[PDB]
Subunit: 206 residues, 5 copies
């Protein structure tokens, strides 16, 4: 009965929350982004493509997802399918293959309205690995950002400019020399609204 | 702020509630098409296939998607999944693999009824790269157009005949010597009505 | 108002129109034709060949007939191929799942004709020995219904000559000839005859 | 007009049959077990990969079973004796290759033929990569490989798996294959594990082949 | 026989209309037992340090909400159901380099005490340096499996043994197995007061 009780309290919370159209200029949203780089799998010098495996941490906060734990049996967080909630359209801008998702698509929602979503991904992107067989290595970069929302609708932030490297694969064919993730504001001539991306820059060698 | 979210939900609800059944000879449609070439990833002379990554910009305008911003809290635009609305069946005529989609598929609808849809794609198509190792380079071409709508239903237009190369990957294995996109009208033995395509012609070398 | 009127006539038509497939009492004729675009690849290590082609399919249902005069003079419309019955026509010696290159949309006309032309890439069983010679190599593949006999689905072509007017002029392979021949198979097992179209292609580097 | 009405009449009778056929069958059980007959038609050995010991087969897998819940009297349904239906509309057995190395690839539509006595015939074409050492294929004696097929989750108390013959049908084998078949058999096997009182049934496909 | 089918359908209707199970929580936690049956090391790629494994992954858990008295249901003790019809754990490989490939139907066995048995066959590419596979000591690689979003306070992981089942290992694989273990690990992250659990698969092999 106590188990049924706690299950009922969670079902009641989720039912209440699921009964938000995305950010707008009137209701903008900040998304925090961070990369945990696991592996440089392949560097292909015949096509100038490089394959990364990483965890992409995304976090945003919505008033529509807030609740008072006292009103819901002291539940402070829950797990739901990422398809049950809005998620940002953050995309690599210079990929050469569809990203491959390696993990279940499940987000964690906290009572303050906070959402954490961390998909693991394999990405092929445009990168000339010339010099990777040298001491100074090779340098490659790829920008991530919303596909359809400007800086007036989604702002992008990092908690740090240092890519988390504490899970990089120790026996990779490639050693990481540096890995940074840097927010950039762009002003294009096409458009008066600013655009935001996070630039991932990785220096590596064999 | 719940007010602005409610205004956007009211607009979307009004718009989604005659449904637009696609264009016809009595209600024809003009689709504007343009390419922004990012990369020639691979040119395979053993099979005469070449792989291209590009943005394909598509734009059209529908009365049924118009609204007065005054009646909807001055909302001027919104975002919706491309699967939630009619989109044109623009197709490469001479691909050799199903096109790969590299971006979210989200359209931007604006209050004048116009729709902007810009998928990023990777495409393999029939292309003989003989001469790519020479100064004159190699020239290839591929037509894009509606698969099943004639020019009396979907007409195509370009805003320029010059393919934008400013996002072309500077360290590609191949450099672009020229890239044009040209509207064509074609009649076919099969079918009584002309079909419209845009011919994408690219000249490139190592 | 005029554009809303025509959109409403189309939606009324589609609504009114929206069959358990064919049977021996209610049989169906499918017309089939091939437009061969490219022999992409001829793999002598596995005796597989990859073709790219348009496959014209056409059939007629009384259940999709209408009088244009009752529907604002509409003579035809477009609809998703997953919204209507389509025949189970299949290559009999493929070695990979066919790859679909075109959107799956059919044309329907007021006489009840359905018209469907998927672009496709097909790997199929083919020994290319001889392709590096003047006589070339020759390969064949049969197309037909998977589960319907000739008493349920009859296959017809409009001609035995494959359409080569869109063959890729710079292919690695040149086409010496390409034919698409209706065949009636009579088996002793079964009272019903079976029907395929045999696609025969002779080609060389 | 009369012809039109005859056509609609037969259509209505078939729609009535399928609507009538569709207590729902919940799959087989120890109380209501089921026999599934399995036979293979080998079309082609496409590829033998000696660097990974994987071999690729194209074949038709014939499956047959009979359900009381699919019977009907043709007299009650306009003399209809059989119909075609998508394999997703009915229960189908979970017959699986036990040592595949890639997901099976389906090459044909997934359509079953249901006959008025309740017998179902389902013949999908498939491409399968499975574990196989091709050492000897470049010799006159050839190489021999095997793969077991069986239900993934039903024991012999729920699904009895049978063959009609040990002889794999080779009459459609591709005459210009890179590999010629020396023999191919399909044999029912019963395993008992001491863990569990229930038997477990597979059909073992054994193929001996060599470079052409 | 119609009566036994109606009993099974009655049971399945009663279980699937029960409040709905929302997944495990701190207050309603769950233990998942994991075990691997290793069939084949298909491929070891030294140019990318990726290795491909084929295995069966046994998963077992128990839910109050799937319990029933066989006496109320014609002595039915178990049934088969699609894995999409029940809650299943988000068990994931932490260092794969391609999406896992599923080789078996996604069907589970549910038992009257509420236990679920689900055993997918899988092909997995994961991060592994095969240097030494050409030698007598062989090479050694490891990959963790665990929930993707659930802590040890919601999903505990157990193995029934630490010895990977090698009884179905392919005898003519390009590679032989020197040893293979599956070890529960308790993992503490500075982010979080709750422990995280994984099962570490360690395989030593050689040509
Ligand atoms: C290249 N298209 C194809 C070219 C083609 C096409 C047939 C051979 C050889 C190159 C795409 C591309 C644009 C132009 C023609 C387009 N198109 C759309 C359709 C639909 N359609 C049919 C389909 C099957 C059978 C008959 C018809 C039919 C009859 C009248 C009007 C339209 C028809 N047919 N062709 C298809």
């Amino acid at each position: 009965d106590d188990k049924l009780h706690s299950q009922a309290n969670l079902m009641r919370l989720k039912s209440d929350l699921f009964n938000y159209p995305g950010p707008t200029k009137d209701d903008p949203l900040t998304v925090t982004l961070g990369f945990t780089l696991q592996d440089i799998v392949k560097a292909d010098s015949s096509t100038n493509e490089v394959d990364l495996v990483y965890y992409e941490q995304q976090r945003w906060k919505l008033n529509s997802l807030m609740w008072d734990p006292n009103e819901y049996g002291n539940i402070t967080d829950f797990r739901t399918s990422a398809a049950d909630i809005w998620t940002p359209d953050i995309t690599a801008y210079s990929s050469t293959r569809p990203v491959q998702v390696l993990s279940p698509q499940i987000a964690v929602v906290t009572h303050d309205g906070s959402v954490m979503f961390i998909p693991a991904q394999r990405l092929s992107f445009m990168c000339d690995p010339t010099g990777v067989d040298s001491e100074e290595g090779a340098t490659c970069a790829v920008k991530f950002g919303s596909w359809v929302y400007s800086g007036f609708e989604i702002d992008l932030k990092t908690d740090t400019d240092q890519v988390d490297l504490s899970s990089y694969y120790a026996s990779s064919k490639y050693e990481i020399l540096s890995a940074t993730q840097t927010r950039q504001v762009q002003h294009y001539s096409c458009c008066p609204e600013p655009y935001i991306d996070v630039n991932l820059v990785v220096k590596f060698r064999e």
